[PDB]
Design a protein around this motif. Sequence first.
Motif, PDB file in Angstrom:
ATOM      1  N   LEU C  67       0.819  -1.214   0.000  1.00 50.79           N
ATOM      2  CA  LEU C  67       0.000   0.000   0.000  1.00 50.79           C
ATOM      3  C   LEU C  67       0.853   1.265   0.000  1.00 50.79           C
ATOM      4  O   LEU C  67       0.523   2.239  -0.682  1.00 50.79           O
ATOM      5  CB  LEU C  67      -0.978   0.027   1.193  1.00 50.79           C
ATOM      6  CG  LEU C  67      -2.312  -0.710   1.023  1.00 50.79           C
ATOM      7  CD1 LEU C  67      -3.016  -0.928   2.357  1.00 50.79           C
ATOM      8  CD2 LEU C  67      -3.213   0.061   0.072  1.00 50.79           C
ATOM      9  N   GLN C  71       1.529   4.519  -2.992  1.00 46.17           N
ATOM     10  CA  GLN C  71       1.669   5.941  -2.710  1.00 46.17           C
ATOM     11  C   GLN C  71       2.837   6.521  -3.490  1.00 46.17           C
ATOM     12  O   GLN C  71       2.700   7.573  -4.114  1.00 46.17           O
ATOM     13  CB  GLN C  71       1.837   6.202  -1.205  1.00 46.17           C
ATOM     14  CG  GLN C  71       0.570   5.939  -0.390  1.00 46.17           C
ATOM     15  CD  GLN C  71       0.399   6.868   0.805  1.00 46.17           C
ATOM     16  OE1 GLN C  71       1.228   7.746   1.057  1.00 46.17           O
ATOM     17  NE2 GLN C  71      -0.693   6.682   1.542  1.00 46.17           N
ATOM     18  N   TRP C  74       1.889   6.960  -7.209  1.00 41.75           N
ATOM     19  CA  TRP C  74       1.000   8.073  -7.515  1.00 41.75           C
ATOM     20  C   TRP C  74       1.642   9.408  -7.191  1.00 41.75           C
ATOM     21  O   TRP C  74       1.485  10.361  -7.960  1.00 41.75           O
ATOM     22  CB  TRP C  74      -0.337   7.931  -6.774  1.00 41.75           C
ATOM     23  CG  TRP C  74      -1.434   8.766  -7.352  1.00 41.75           C
ATOM     24  CD1 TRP C  74      -2.376   8.368  -8.260  1.00 41.75           C
ATOM     25  CD2 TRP C  74      -1.710  10.144  -7.062  1.00 41.75           C
ATOM     26  NE1 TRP C  74      -3.220   9.413  -8.555  1.00 41.75           N
ATOM     27  CE2 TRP C  74      -2.835  10.514  -7.834  1.00 41.75           C
ATOM     28  CE3 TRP C  74      -1.116  11.102  -6.224  1.00 41.75           C
ATOM     29  CZ2 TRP C  74      -3.378  11.806  -7.794  1.00 41.75           C
ATOM     30  CZ3 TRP C  74      -1.654  12.387  -6.190  1.00 41.75           C
ATOM     31  CH2 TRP C  74      -2.776  12.723  -6.970  1.00 41.75           C
ATOM     32  N   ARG C  85       2.334  20.445 -16.967  1.00 44.14           N
ATOM     33  CA  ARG C  85       1.443  21.587 -16.710  1.00 44.14           C
ATOM     34  C   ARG C  85       2.216  22.900 -16.766  1.00 44.14           C
ATOM     35  O   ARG C  85       1.711  23.899 -17.292  1.00 44.14           O
ATOM     36  CB  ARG C  85       0.757  21.456 -15.339  1.00 44.14           C
ATOM     37  CG  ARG C  85      -0.389  20.454 -15.279  1.00 44.14           C
ATOM     38  CD  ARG C  85      -1.651  20.998 -15.927  1.00 44.14           C
ATOM     39  NE  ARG C  85      -2.862  20.370 -15.393  1.00 44.14           N
ATOM     40  CZ  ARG C  85      -3.288  19.140 -15.687  1.00 44.14           C
ATOM     41  NH1 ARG C  85      -2.610  18.357 -16.523  1.00 44.14           N
ATOM     42  NH2 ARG C  85      -4.410  18.683 -15.136  1.00 44.14           N
TER      43      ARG C  85
END
Lengths: 387, 128, 87, 156
Positions: C67, C71, C74, C85
């Motif tokens: 888990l 993290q 992502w 961006r």
Amino acid sequence: MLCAISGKVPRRPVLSPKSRTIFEKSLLEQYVKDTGNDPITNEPLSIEEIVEIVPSAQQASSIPNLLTSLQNEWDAIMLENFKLRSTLDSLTKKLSTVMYERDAAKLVAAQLLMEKNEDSKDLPKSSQQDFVARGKLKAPKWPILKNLELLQKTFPYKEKWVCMCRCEDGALHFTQLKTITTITTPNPRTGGEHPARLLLLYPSKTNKVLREMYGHNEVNTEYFIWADNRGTIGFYIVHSAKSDVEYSSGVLHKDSLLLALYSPDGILDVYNLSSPDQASSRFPAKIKEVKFADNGYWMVVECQTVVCFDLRKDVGTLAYPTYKTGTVTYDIDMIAYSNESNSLTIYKFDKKKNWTKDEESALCLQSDTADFTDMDVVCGDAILKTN
Amino acid sequence: MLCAISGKVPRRPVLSPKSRTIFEKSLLEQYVKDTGNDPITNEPLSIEEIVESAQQASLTESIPNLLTSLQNEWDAIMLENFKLRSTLDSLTKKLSTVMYERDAAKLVAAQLLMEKNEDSKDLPKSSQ
Amino acid sequence: MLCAISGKVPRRPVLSPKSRTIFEKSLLEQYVKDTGNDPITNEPLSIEEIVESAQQASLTESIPNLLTSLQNEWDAIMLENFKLRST
Amino acid sequence: MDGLSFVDKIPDGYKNEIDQLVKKEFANIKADNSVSTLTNALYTEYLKQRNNKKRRTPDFNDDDDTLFLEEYRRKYPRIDTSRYIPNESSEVSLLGIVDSYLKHQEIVLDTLLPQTVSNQWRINNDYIRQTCTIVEEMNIQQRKQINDLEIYRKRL
């Protein structure tokens, strides 16, 4: 979603860069103009120090919380596994301490038994050196079963009718057509019978229910226990696969939690009614009759002997061996035990014979005590006798 | 080196000062909020009472993390606890067989304690 | 794996309950007998304060470790979006 | 309660004998949410929930559906090739550093195996002396018992 000065929902959330706490632009600005300080920590702060307006730029306004949710559910998984394991190992300690102490306590017996044995040979080698006939039909003669109403009234079963008779008036109150077992309800208006495959419940001189070797009324007065040659008992309907044989008789213990069923292969089977389980078997020919004492701890059984059992120890403490003799019926008054078959005999339970009657010709099929043992009653292959 | 709740190898271990036992922060923080006490010793303990690197070599074939690895983890969690529930049920049944057989032996001893001494007593009386 | 006072591999590790750090018992014992303190934070500590159940563990390998892995995936990919961006 | 284990040097027949007497006296006496529901059902049924068997197969000249499936394979293969780069950079150093941790973890267990071993043998060691103490006293008692037994006879 709250300012840390007034407590309002901030429409322009600005923050001081000395103590992290989101205020509203109006209030913090009024505090700074009042005195150049942070309201929470009383440190140095100015108007230009404040970061004003929302932050969204090159960001765009799901996924991350799914992983958070996956963590939250796992957090429980671990907490559950802990408490499950604690009880696992904590019970294993009880298991281990018991098994060890069991086989330890088992060795006590092995030692004890051999010493007890040694005491025997040692000492042994040393010591060495009214009569009513008209209740039932004359042409099909015989009464086969007897009960007295517990609250007062005689009930007999005949070689096919069930009869209620009043000892005081000497009248037959009812002849019930529709018999080897009979039971008188304490309510006086209900009587029960059974025969070679029904149980019948009678009022109105009528049979109100036909329920499809022994019959016994439960302590509550609301239920009947039956045994049969079909190998089952019924209240639910159960048999022993292991034993698998005819049940020859059936009686409830007076407290109504356990009962006994005799078998054709000489066992007395004790059952727990609630659990419907066979909890004990007393061994030692076909069982003919069993009777529980009102003392709640004696059981008498017959098969040409009458054996007495203490239910607290589960042991046979006395056996009365008769000769050809058939014991067909057993009943305690708990001061006295009566037996009937070849003849009628009454024993004092304290010292184990006080009465002996041989008036019937041929088999006696039933015996009973009147209230306070003020009389005894018996029935035979036509008469009902009172003593 | 392990945590004393889940059976983990903690990433941020934290020790309680009432009972010296190292727990993983998340799991001890959860217990205190559920019921504010130390899980092992059942002593009063709070979040402020607590006092605060491991390498796992991610496999060479590390798709599998979404599909194969994650599947195995929830299989292994599922079939273990189910099997662990099976183990707890039998221990309680085997408990009942232990205590019954124990009490059965007690009655034998009590029965034989009356038997032996009276047999010995009879030998002492025999002499007379 | 290491002792913070000496720097050796401690053969009898005992963790303190004031400054959380794995010390060698024989080393920390002498530090306490010198003065009742923890060597790192200089907070009070006694010998009884220093400390050397039933759930079985397995080694930390590639559910919780899986888990925390996702993290990293992502959180790294989120920075990859900033690079495009901003550009 | 008392049954001397060390002193009583008790056959298998005696265990079989005593078992029968114990047997005869036994003849006489006779917090989680939805998570737990699906987990228990998965284990009971013996069936794991199916995952996405899609990325591996796919097919060229598909449609708008396989246009997505294709574009999935690219990004994950680039993530894959980046995920293999940072592993190979360190390489075997990251692996052998964790191998060392596992040796520290292992030795700790076997130290406790000895600590338990010593205290377990130490308890049994104390019992042994007790067994031999009383076993003598019982021997003393029995000798005296047998003396009276014949003494009382020879007087009479």
